[PDB]
Design an enzyme around this catalytic site. Structure first.
Site, PDB file in Angstrom:
ATOM      1  N   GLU A 155      -3.023  13.414   3.204  1.00  0.00           N
ATOM      2  CA  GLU A 155      -3.984  12.878   4.224  1.00  0.00           C
ATOM      3  C   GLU A 155      -4.503  14.030   5.054  1.00  0.00           C
ATOM      4  OE1 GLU A 155      -2.121   9.274   5.993  1.00  0.00           O
ATOM      5  OE2 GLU A 155      -3.558   8.384   4.583  1.00  0.00           O
ATOM      6  N   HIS A 187       7.502   6.894   5.009  1.00  0.00           N
ATOM      7  CA  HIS A 187       6.729   6.560   3.804  1.00  0.00           C
ATOM      8  C   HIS A 187       5.956   7.801   3.385  1.00  0.00           C
ATOM      9  CE1 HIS A 187       3.994   5.933   7.196  1.00  0.00           C
ATOM     10  NE2 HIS A 187       3.092   6.457   6.337  1.00  0.00           N
ATOM     11  N   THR A 245      -3.054   6.209  10.334  1.00  0.00           N
ATOM     12  CA  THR A 245      -3.993   6.497   9.221  1.00  0.00           C
ATOM     13  C   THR A 245      -4.254   5.248   8.369  1.00  0.00           C
ATOM     14  OG1 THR A 245      -2.399   7.213   7.578  1.00  0.00           O
ATOM     15  CG2 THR A 245      -3.266   8.913   9.158  1.00  0.00           C
ATOM     16  N   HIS A 247       5.437  10.901   5.905  1.00  0.00           N
ATOM     17  CA  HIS A 247       5.319  10.511   7.334  1.00  0.00           C
ATOM     18  C   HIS A 247       6.621   9.860   7.834  1.00  0.00           C
ATOM     19  CE1 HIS A 247       0.682  10.298   6.897  1.00  0.00           C
ATOM     20  NE2 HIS A 247       1.139  11.560   7.058  1.00  0.00           N
ATOM     21  N   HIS A 249       0.816  -1.221   0.000  1.00  0.00           N
ATOM     22  CA  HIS A 249       0.000   0.000   0.000  1.00  0.00           C
ATOM     23  C   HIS A 249       0.852   1.276   0.000  1.00  0.00           C
ATOM     24  CE1 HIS A 249       0.136  -1.252   4.196  1.00  0.00           C
ATOM     25  NE2 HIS A 249       0.424   0.077   4.327  1.00  0.00           N
ATOM     26  N   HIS A 274       2.178   9.166   1.212  1.00  0.00           N
ATOM     27  CA  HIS A 274       0.842   8.964   0.637  1.00  0.00           C
ATOM     28  C   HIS A 274       0.745   9.943  -0.541  1.00  0.00           C
ATOM     29  CE1 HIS A 274      -0.511   6.807   4.346  1.00  0.00           C
ATOM     30  NE2 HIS A 274       0.447   7.615   4.972  1.00  0.00           N
TER      31      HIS A 274
HETATM   32  N1  W1O Z   1       0.296   6.507   8.029  1.00  0.00           N
HETATM   33  S1  W1O Z   1       0.856   6.485   9.585  1.00  0.00           S
HETATM   34  O1  W1O Z   1       2.104   7.215   9.635  1.00  0.00           O
HETATM   35  O2  W1O Z   1      -0.216   6.882  10.466  1.00  0.00           O
HETATM   36  C1  W1O Z   1       1.326   4.806  10.026  1.00  0.00           C
HETATM   37  C2  W1O Z   1       0.436   3.791   9.717  1.00  0.00           C
HETATM   38  C3  W1O Z   1       0.751   2.475  10.005  1.00  0.00           C
HETATM   39  C4  W1O Z   1       1.948   2.142  10.634  1.00  0.00           C
HETATM   40  C5  W1O Z   1       2.162   0.756  11.233  1.00  0.00           C
HETATM   41  N2  W1O Z   1       1.678  -0.320  10.372  1.00  0.00           N
HETATM   42  C6  W1O Z   1       2.262  -0.444   9.147  1.00  0.00           C
HETATM   43  O3  W1O Z   1       3.280   0.218   8.953  1.00  0.00           O
HETATM   44  N3  W1O Z   1       1.772  -1.374   8.253  1.00  0.00           N
HETATM   45  C7  W1O Z   1       0.433  -1.998   8.227  1.00  0.00           C
HETATM   46  C8  W1O Z   1       0.506  -3.448   7.744  1.00  0.00           C
HETATM   47  N4  W1O Z   1       1.121  -3.470   6.412  1.00  0.00           N
HETATM   48  C9  W1O Z   1       0.846  -4.614   5.629  1.00  0.00           C
HETATM   49  C10 W1O Z   1       1.849  -5.446   5.144  1.00  0.00           C
HETATM   50  C11 W1O Z   1       1.539  -6.533   4.335  1.00  0.00           C
HETATM   51  C12 W1O Z   1       0.196  -6.813   4.000  1.00  0.00           C
HETATM   52  C13 W1O Z   1      -0.816  -5.982   4.472  1.00  0.00           C
HETATM   53  C14 W1O Z   1      -0.480  -4.924   5.261  1.00  0.00           C
HETATM   54  F1  W1O Z   1      -1.459  -4.085   5.626  1.00  0.00           F
HETATM   55  C15 W1O Z   1      -0.175  -8.014   3.264  1.00  0.00           C
HETATM   56  O4  W1O Z   1      -1.358  -8.284   3.035  1.00  0.00           O
HETATM   57  C16 W1O Z   1       0.902  -8.877   2.917  1.00  0.00           C
HETATM   58  C17 W1O Z   1       0.697 -10.197   2.258  1.00  0.00           C
HETATM   59  O5  W1O Z   1       1.601 -11.037   2.450  1.00  0.00           O
HETATM   60  O6  W1O Z   1      -0.398 -10.344   1.567  1.00  0.00           O
HETATM   61  C18 W1O Z   1       2.195  -8.552   3.272  1.00  0.00           C
HETATM   62  N5  W1O Z   1       2.539  -7.422   3.929  1.00  0.00           N
HETATM   63  C19 W1O Z   1       3.933  -7.200   4.324  1.00  0.00           C
HETATM   64  C20 W1O Z   1       4.809  -6.144   3.732  1.00  0.00           C
HETATM   65  C21 W1O Z   1       5.048  -7.579   3.402  1.00  0.00           C
HETATM   66  C22 W1O Z   1       2.503  -2.989   6.472  1.00  0.00           C
HETATM   67  C23 W1O Z   1       2.573  -1.559   7.015  1.00  0.00           C
HETATM   68  C24 W1O Z   1       2.845   3.171  10.943  1.00  0.00           C
HETATM   69  C25 W1O Z   1       2.540   4.503  10.642  1.00  0.00           C
HETATM   70 ZN    ZN Z   2       1.351   7.452   6.679  1.00  0.00          ZN
END
Ligand code: W1O
Ligand code: ZN
EC number: 4.2.1.1
Length: 258
Positions: free
Chosen positions: A104, A92, A196, A117, A62, A94
């Site tokens: 965002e 990262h 987010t 971010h 994403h 957006h």
């Molecule tokens: N915008 S913000 O600054 O507020 C902000 C938001 C969010 C964060 C903390 N969480 C994240 O960082 N994540 C969420 C989970 N994400 C995913 C990785 C996925 C999949 C799905 C996921 F959603 C799959 O489906 C998948 C597969 O094998 O099909 C493989 N991978 C991993 C990478 C190989 C990775 C990133 C920090 C900061």
């Molecule tokens: Zn972000």
């Protein structure tokens, strides 16, 4: 059938798997510049990135994440609204399909072409997984991108994107200095909010810089050549990976500047 940014799985659907989507401190928000209050008690932010150790760049399906060594206090954010020391774990972006959308956060309902971010976690909780469970666990530095002149400090990121086109691809990304992504001024707005993306955890102190950075059309065009899909799968360009503004509810946005 997992969350994403398409018709069938985008932001308006997330609440079914993640009910906190409709919570009291969700992000992003619109920044109403006339309602934000100057808070003379805030400090200057301390961005200490001189010892940053970048390791890798990952297309996670994403966005793409530039990951850092956060196993010691190398690149930290302190001061401003924060108590204590927050370690840089990843940055990262957006971005949009068109220059008129992609951020965002919004400023008086203005959308920027993209938003950076820089994600940091509070060292008093020991690891990132523990920090996201706490209301003061993370500090995210948000920086708007507008399209105009190139950002020299971005080009090393742009030139590696062809090597991580599809979901799950990574590349070595050593010796990258995130100081080259900062604007001149550290004037900011701050409010308590959330991740987010799912799981949408209410763990973030948001620090959003007022001054955008300028990137070139060629630079953002290369962001839009990335894929949400894995290798060999139908191509879905990685564009419009932003959550729209959420209700402010019982929150005050504070300004560091008069
Ligand atoms: N915008 S913000 O600054 O507020 C902000 C938001 C969010 C964060 C903390 N969480 C994240 O960082 N994540 C969420 C989970 N994400 C995913 C990785 C996925 C999949 C799905 C996921 F959603 C799959 O489906 C998948 C597969 O094998 O099909 C493989 N991978 C991993 C990478 C190989 C990775 C990133 C920090 C900061
Ligand atoms: Zn972000």
């Amino acid at each position: 059938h997992h969350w994403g940014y398409g018709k069938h799985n985008g932001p308006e659907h997330w609440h079914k798997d993640f009910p906190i989507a409709k919570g009291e401190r969700q992000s992003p928000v619109d920044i109403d510049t006339h309602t934000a209050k100057y808070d003379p008690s805030l400090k200057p932010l301390s961005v200490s990135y001189d010892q940053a150790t970048s390791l890798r760049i990952l297309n996670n399906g994403h966005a793409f994440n530039v990951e850092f060594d956060d196993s010691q206090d190398k690149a930290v954010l302190k001061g401003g609204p924060l108590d204590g020391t927050y370690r840089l774990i990843q940055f990262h972006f957006h971005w949009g399909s068109l220059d008129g959308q992609g951020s965002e956060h919004t400023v008086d309902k203005k959308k920027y072409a993209a938003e950076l971010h820089l994600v940091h976690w509070n060292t008093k909780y020991g690891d990132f997984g523990k920090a996201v469970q706490q209301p003061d666990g993370l500090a995210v530095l948000g920086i708007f991108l507008k399209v105009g002149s190139a950002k020299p400090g971005l080009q090393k990121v742009v030139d590696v994107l062809d090597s991580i086109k599809t979901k799950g691809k990574s590349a070595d990304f050593t010796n990258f200095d995130p100081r080259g992504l900062l604007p001149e001024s550290l004037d900011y707005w701050t409010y308590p909010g959330s991740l987010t993306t799912p799981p949408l955890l209410e763990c973030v102190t948001w620090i959003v810089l007022k001054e955008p950075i300028s990137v070139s059309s060629e630079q953002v065009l290369k962001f839009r050549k990335l894929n949400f899909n894995g290798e060999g799968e139908p191509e879905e360009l990685m564009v419009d990976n932003w959550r729209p503004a959420q209700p402010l509810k019982n929150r005050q946005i504070k300004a560091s500047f008069k």
